[PDB]
Design a protein around this ligand. Sequence first.
Ligand SMILES: [Se]
Lengths: 553, 552
Amino acid sequence: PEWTAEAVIEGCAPLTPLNMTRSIAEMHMEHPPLGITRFFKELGYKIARFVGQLIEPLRRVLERHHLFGAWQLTSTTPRAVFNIFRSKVDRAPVELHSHYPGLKKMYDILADLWLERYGSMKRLTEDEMASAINRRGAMGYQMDNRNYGDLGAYWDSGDWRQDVNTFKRALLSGTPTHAVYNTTAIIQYLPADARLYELKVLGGLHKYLEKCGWSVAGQGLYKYGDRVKKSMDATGAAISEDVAGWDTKISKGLLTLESHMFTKLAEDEEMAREIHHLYRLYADPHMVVQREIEGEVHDVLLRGRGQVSSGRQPTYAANTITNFITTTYGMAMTLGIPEADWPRLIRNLTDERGNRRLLVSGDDKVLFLRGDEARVYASSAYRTSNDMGLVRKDMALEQESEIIVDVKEISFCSHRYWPVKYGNEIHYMPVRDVGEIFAKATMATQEAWARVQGLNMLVNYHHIPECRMLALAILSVTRIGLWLRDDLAPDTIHALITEGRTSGWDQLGYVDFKDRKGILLRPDTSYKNWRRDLPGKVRQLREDGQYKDWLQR
Amino acid sequence: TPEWTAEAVIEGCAPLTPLNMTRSIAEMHMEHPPLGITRFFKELGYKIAFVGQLIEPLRRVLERHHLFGAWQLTSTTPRAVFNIFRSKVDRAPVELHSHYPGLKKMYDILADLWLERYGSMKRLTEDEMASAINRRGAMGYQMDNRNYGDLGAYWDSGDWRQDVNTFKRALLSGTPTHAVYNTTAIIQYLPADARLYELKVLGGLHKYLEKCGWSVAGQGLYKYGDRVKKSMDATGAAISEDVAGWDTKISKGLLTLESHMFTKLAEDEEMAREIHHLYRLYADPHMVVQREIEGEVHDVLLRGRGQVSSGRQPTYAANTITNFITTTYGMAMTLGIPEADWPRLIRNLTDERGNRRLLVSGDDKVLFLRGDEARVYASSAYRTSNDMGLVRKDMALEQESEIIVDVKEISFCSHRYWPVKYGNEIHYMPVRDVGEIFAKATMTQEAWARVQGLNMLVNYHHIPECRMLALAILSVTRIGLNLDLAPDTIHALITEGRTSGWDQLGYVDFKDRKGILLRPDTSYKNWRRDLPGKVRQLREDGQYKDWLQRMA
Ligand SMILES: [Se]
């Protein structure tokens, strides 16, 4: 119903709403709006086998002492879909605060460092686009009638070349086609022709992130732990605070600074107008979310103001940049760093020099500081993020930050990092609750998709014994011939970790036996019987194809 | 029509039987039948066709009183290349002699010692390769059509990854691709993909040598004199004898022992097959040399048997191993050391214990012995090396060896070594004819010159004219090229940081500044006089620093 006024950000082109009458009509609303949301404006509504068996003998201890989670409601009813929307998404971002000129100055600094060092940003190419799509992606309501199976099918047909140009021409006129977000359970995504356009236009942001020492873009999970140890060694204190529902809290004001920075990176004038028009869409999101009232399912069209959508490929790069800026800003403000040193500050963070480091990935971030500046930051830095509504999760509003002094306690990208011996080298490797690893590996071509999880798990989680054995069991049960290949050997793994200074199955280390507790499986009777029965269990599932014995390693 | 002698059949060793060279020979595009005017090689066919300006005031003195010549002022006509080759390379190695059983035992003893102590040998990693290749290296005729600029452009492209596997797979099949040597003026080399493969397979030999007390592998030249003094201090006499054209005299029989030894070092059986197949190539060398007859330039494909090519990355490591084994075998035989003590002898030479010491680098060797055993070695040890054709350069066949008793008379790696005082320490530093030093040092051009400036300052600061030129080079080249050095780095290399400053970097004595070193006469003083102005005259738009201030 009643929105606050927007912020007036000097020096920035405003994200004026586009003419959405064409895109709204493609959704085919029938009935007037009910209006039961507190921030979103309703405009109208219309009437609507391999990994699992391999881990089944471990399922009971995984449900009881770990986060396997058989408590998945499977089908999210339309009533539950709307309930999640109303509690998590239907909340007004904080638009009015006094930090935009400071934040803008830092967006400008980062943009200038990037142009100075690496030049202007280009649209993605077809091969760069081809390597980045989720071929399993959905088509969207506005394009189901064209009958493609998914994104990969619609990509292979080459029909996207004309839809993307059609989408681009409609967007640049001010009256876009296919501009209304679809939702699933809340994941928000535009139709597939819109997603290839925004991937082509903004996909280059990832390239800059590959050059920044405070980003992990284009690095394997196996590289993260040493980066955490490296940053911790140069500082000694870390602050890792998650924000509750980060996507839902980004303001239209911050999106304006995002658009302003990205247009500044555009190589030509037209590309800048494309980026700007994409953000006119983003800051004025229209989406269709299901409800259920009196046994009747509705598709509900709702209008919001400037949040961040789940299923846009640029979101990761965009969230990563904005999380870095806002964190460095609040940090610089709290520590009293003068504006004149802000260029050196961003430069140093990018180059990993000095005694302050950041690691940022999406809404996930770790701030590294010396002991004295950590205490200063911990006592008051929350005041600035609270002004912008970036409220920290599971903490009281004004609780002082927890200061981490043990590198094994630093959580980042949902993992902690422990030292694992590789020959005479030590490298920090990821650990999380093995229920979560196993849950992803089995839910989150079925024999084809299973063999990827086995290849994934062996490279990334070989130091967790149960993860190596499930990986070797997956590889023994999936058939041959369906960076990591059928010929995946330790030499491939040692090159990723130690650049080939180690070799052989013998030099792939494990975690200490004492720490195989808590998040990892305690080696108990259920574990021993799983291991004892594992070779017998790989033989009963094998069918038809040719196979190799892996558990012997 | 050259008629080779019989080969040698060495017991216990896999023979280096020739490879099917048909495919690799066909890659050279030969057009005409052989002329056949070589005495040893068999012709198969033929086909048709900054620093400089800084030292210029010393050009006259360097050309008359030192070994400078007129650098980069002449090139070699094709007739001259073939004369060079016909005189130096076209000579049969000595394959038939009685020393192969004794030599194999020591090859076996050394291989067993390394395995026991340091484990098996692995192929180099991609970082290990990258940090050892010669980026300006040539591509080879068989690879010019791929339009790479040099080896670095080839390496940075990542196209080498499959070519090396393609080379590997052709080699192991017995019919290699790209196995014929190219030549330049005589340096011989395979195409760039082959040199990456052979560096990958055999590049690990270097790691073994860095652990041997008789090797200077992976040590800077600034460490050599102290090694010479330390070996001299433990012995009292030295014999330093150069072999004329060492590469041209290694036999196929000796290559069979090298291959035999390195296959034993391999960490798995397919590595062993790769090494042996590479030596099936080395022992059966095909190369293309130029010649000129009646005004017509030829590319002549020639086939020989079992000598050593220089444009091969493992050649250094292989040569110093064989140099050590043949020298250790000759000394043991001549001194009457029984076979049962050969394991301890090799171990002791590796550990720098006992009263016999060796220093080996390529074909350069110095044998350190007590005065008594030095007399025995000098009077007959040449018999054994003459038997293997390793004839000593510039001496009669049976001239007794020169016995050296003054540590400063010892030549090793083209240098002699004089004591230079660093604070209260003495360290032996390399000296040679400064005409050679300046000649060796004479875009990428400015970057290259500045590296010669940093190298010369590190290695030759004790030579005054060398320090001054290096400081001049450091003042005339920009800051920030693609190569901050201070004396704190130099002392760290020489005295482990026990000394410090410019004022503790020693000089040679004034009296010894003659002969090989420049005499500080009128040409020298005028050169020093005009150097600051020539430095300013040669500067271009970069950011420079003055270095001449660090002397006078
Ligand atoms: Se395992």
